[PDB]
Amino acid sequence: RKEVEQDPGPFNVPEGATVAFNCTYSNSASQSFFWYRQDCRKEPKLLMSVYSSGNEDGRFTAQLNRASQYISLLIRDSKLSDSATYLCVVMGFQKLVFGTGTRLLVSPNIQNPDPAVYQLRDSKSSDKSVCLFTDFDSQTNVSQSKDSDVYITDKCVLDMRSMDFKSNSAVAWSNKSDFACANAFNNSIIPEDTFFPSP
Amino acid sequence: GVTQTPRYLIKTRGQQVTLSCSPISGHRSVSWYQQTPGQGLQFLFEYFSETQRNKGNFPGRFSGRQFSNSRSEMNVSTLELGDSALYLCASSLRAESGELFFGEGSRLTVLEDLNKVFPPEVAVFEPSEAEISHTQKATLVCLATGFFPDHVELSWWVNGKEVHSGVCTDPQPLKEQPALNDSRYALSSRLRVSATFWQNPRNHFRCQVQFYGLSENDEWTQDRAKPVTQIVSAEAWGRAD
Amino acid sequence: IVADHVASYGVNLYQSYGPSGQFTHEFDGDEEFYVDLERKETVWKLPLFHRLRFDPQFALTNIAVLKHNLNILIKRSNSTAATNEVPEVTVFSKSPVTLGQPNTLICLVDNIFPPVVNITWLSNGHSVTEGVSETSFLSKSDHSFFKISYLTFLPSADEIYDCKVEHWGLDEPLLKHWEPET
Amino acid sequence: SPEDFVYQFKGMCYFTNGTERVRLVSRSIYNREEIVRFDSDVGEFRAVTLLGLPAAEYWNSQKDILERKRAAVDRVCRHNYQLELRTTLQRRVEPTVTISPSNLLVCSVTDFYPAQIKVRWFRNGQEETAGVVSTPLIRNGDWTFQILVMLEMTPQRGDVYTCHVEHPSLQSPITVEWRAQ
Amino acid sequence: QPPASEQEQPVLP
Ligand SMILES: *[C@@H]1O[C@H](CO)[C@@H](O[C@@H]2O[C@H](CO)[C@@H](O)[C@H](O)[C@H]2NC(C)=O)[C@H](O)[C@H]1NC(C)=O
Ligand SMILES: *[C@@H]1O[C@H](CO)[C@@H](O)[C@H](O)[C@H]1NC(C)=O
Asked: Is the CB of D90 under 6 A from ligand 2?
């Protein structure tokens, strides 16, 4: 096994829920333990140290169990800004090991979902056409396109803070002459009540 | 704060590169890490009081040094395509600390040939009337396409001021041809405002993509424009009636 | 570690065999002084005139801490005992050797662990005690020790010497030979 | 072979360029295994092995112990270097230089202090770089050193061999001449 | 001022 092992696949958690990260280390002589947070394509930032008694700091709790050699991080009342990769870091004699991390994705609670695919206005400086799948519930998953000439992004969460409104969206685009929003997301399981207004 | 230079780099195979890192004021330990796509942080070396303190598993062509002002430099002698990575430096007050403060990183792309370098084409797509009437909200979409390498930063500007509210950018660029190892990239962002804000004819919207490309010291013999570091933008005005 | 000067302030030692201890200060590898823990006395080894003073009560108090720690660590280690190392012995003269001119024989006993050793001199197979002295156990970076014994002597074509060392790491008493060149 | 259990504590000071860099490393050793260490560069006790982890964690939790350890590099290492400057670091003992055949020619440099020394072989005015085999620096234990530097020689008529020694005790280098007899 | 020396710390039983 690796010296530091963490939860593998991504954590998809609804906003407001409590999330538990787990990490194990093999070297029983390990002296100090830390959690770091890292945004995509960015640098890690120290979050907290880990103590046997359980270091508590606001919504965060980090605990150590030397008998089982387990490290845990608890985040209560998760927010969208918590979305990041969380790295378990273990300090031994002349060795500081960074785990490969556990990616956390915090989803908004969409109270009144209104799923729709809109064809945006063409740009006059572009050969491409854009379709916007938006206002769907956080349980909806967006798949990648089968046609090599159609590009579909992953789901993104925007937050209109002045109106206190959150929404998911995914973008599809192509420069093919036969491109249309009616079938752009055909490889995705989308709600059957999705609004497909005429362009 | 920790300062790392240069922030973005393009090198060709066989070349050498030197990166620099200035620690936080007072901090005397500097450590170097490599962040390769899909790998996790790999330790290069730590320096304290001008002497290398501990070292990772990298080959000899990776070397480093720390000066009397605690500033540190690392060098890679004969670059390979597989050396492309984000190189991070971290500083701490004392040596061998588990509490590190990282710089923003030097993003290095090692290339075959500078003829694969392209700036992004940027276009803004305006909200559909169907969305405006259905939701009383208006989503702008900005597409940056065809750029290589993926050294871009996208921002939205409303009436000459940068905005973050109502904005979501893809966390990382898409590959336009996933098969090729030198495929050009694409990146999408969206900006959502109220229908009232979008229908104000005096409101101005701009999507700005800063691209980091070739320098003036980079040789260019091609016919198309030199893909230099530049800003490429696309804009839109409020739509009345 | 690379440095211009290395000092030990100081070298503290305590062992279970015939409850023995040692306290010394070292500078650049040489013994500055030791504390006679039985006589409660600071014995200076600096090769110069000085008025330096060192309270021997510091050594006794520090060694008492070492005794406290060792007895606990014997339990925690499940009575993991010291491993006997094979010592390495070299005999050589201090100065170029002239017949009939006073000199000093040097017996270096290196890689000593545990720090329990007997070092004796023989001349023509006879035991020699006059003019014999030795250093304390001197520290090494791998935490073994070395010790040097001296024999002041008058080089003669009729006199032949051996350094004899006994150590648990040796199956047999080790005799290292030395003759005047002739 | 009787059983023995050994404990060592070393309060070690490292000096570079006088007092420009002063570093304290205290080492707690069980038998021959260092288990805990306080490095002044690090600022806290660090467990070297599992046996020392409870000790390092406990001492680190004591604020008064950490405060004393953090000052130790000044109260011990820096404080004592002033005394060394007036005693050991003034010691200068000039080396004795002799040449004798052992085909190897041995330049014998004995009874000098400090350890810093440079010795070079010359033959008919030309410095001999190859064929020069040197013993390690030999510590006598009485605050003197010696070293033997050999030269692979070919006895060829009036070849003039010269040993050249430089040492901090000498205002000028010592040159000793040997000719085959 | 006499020469100084470093103290060892007691371990917990
Ligand atoms: C150092 O010398 C002493 C004294 O000769 C040794 O102790 C003797 O050991 C023999 C066994 O070989 C016993 O028969 C004697 O009774 C012991 N005498 C005393 C006074 O204890 C000791 O073993 C030697 N140390 C080493 C490491 O060889
Ligand atoms: C000691 O001084 C020399 C000469 O100025 C210098 O080159 C060296 O870096 C110094 N040592 C340290 C540890 O800075």
From this structure: no
- Retrieve residue A147's tokens: 């046609």
Q: What is the 3-state secondary structure (H, E, C) of chain A?
A: CCCEEECCCCEEEECCCCEEEEEEECCCCCCEEEEEEECCCCCEEEEEECECCCEEECCEEEEEECCCCEEEEEECCCCHHHCEEEEEEEEECCEEEECCCEEEEEECCCCCCCCEEEECCCCCCCCCEEEEEECCCCCCCCCCCCCCCCEECCCEEEEECCCCEEEEEEEEEECCCCCCHHHCCCCCCCCCCCECCCC
Alpha-carbon gap, residue B147 to B227, rounded angstroms: 10
Chain D residues with CB inside 8 Å of E3's CB?
79-80, 83
- Which ligand lies nearest to the CA atom of residue C87 in the structure? 1
Classify D94 as helix, strand or coil. coil
Q: Measured from the CA of C116, which atom of ligand 1 is nearest?
A: 27
Residue C179, SS3 per DSSP: coil
Q: Do residues C127 and C151 lie in contact, with contact meaning Cβ atoms separated by under 8 Å?
A: no
CA of C113 to the centre of ligand 1 (A): 17
For the purposes of burial, counting CB atoms within 10 Å of the CB of C125, is it exposed (0-12), middle (13-18) or buried (19 or more)?
exposed
Whether residues A31 and D47 touch (CB distance < 8 A) is answered with: yes
Tell me if B73 sits within 8 A of B20, measured CB to CB. Answer: yes
Residue environment code for D95-115, b if the CB has 16+ CB neighbours within 10 A, otherwise e: bbbebeeeeebbbbbbbbbbe
- Alpha-carbon gap: B103 to the closest alpha carbon of chain D (Å): 21
Tokens of A134: 């938006």
Of the candidates B165, B158, B142, B144, the residue with the CA atom closest to the CA atom of residue B198: B158
Contact A72, A22 (CB under 8 A): yes
Whether the Cβ atoms of residue B187 and residue B169 lie closer than 8 Å to each other = yes
Name the amino acid, one letter, at A48. Answer: M
From residue C133, alpha-carbon distances to B175, C48, C114, C140, D173 in Å are 80, 19, 21, 21, 34
Distances in whole angstroms, Cα of residue C93 to Cα of each of A156, C118, C179, D84: 83, 20, 10, 29
The type of residue at D51 is L
Do B70 and B53 touch, CB atoms closer than 8 A? no
User: What is the strand order of the sheet A4-6 is part of?
Assistant: A4-6, A19-25, A70-75, A60-65, A55-57
Q: Which letter, b or e, does each residue of A19-57 get, where b requires 16 or more Cβ atoms within 10 Å of its Cβ?
A: bebebbbeeebbbbbbbbbbeeebbbebbbbbeeeebee
Amino acid at D168: P
- Output D63-67 pairs: Cβ under 8 A, ≥24 positions apart: D65/E9
CB contact at 8 A, A162 and A98: no
Q: How many helices (H) and strands (E) does chain E have?
A: 0, 0
Radius of gyration, alpha carbons of chain A = 21
Q: Which two structure tokens, joined as six digits, stand for D70?
A: 């953090």
Q: Distance, in angstroms, between C86 CA and closest chain E CA?
A: 30
Neighbouring-strand partners of residue A195: A116
Resolution in A: 2.2
Q: Which residues of E touch D56 (CB under 8 A)?
A: none
Q: What do you get for the CA distance between the two ends of chain A, in Å?
A: 55
Mapped onto helix, strand or coil, the DSSP state of residue D74 is helix
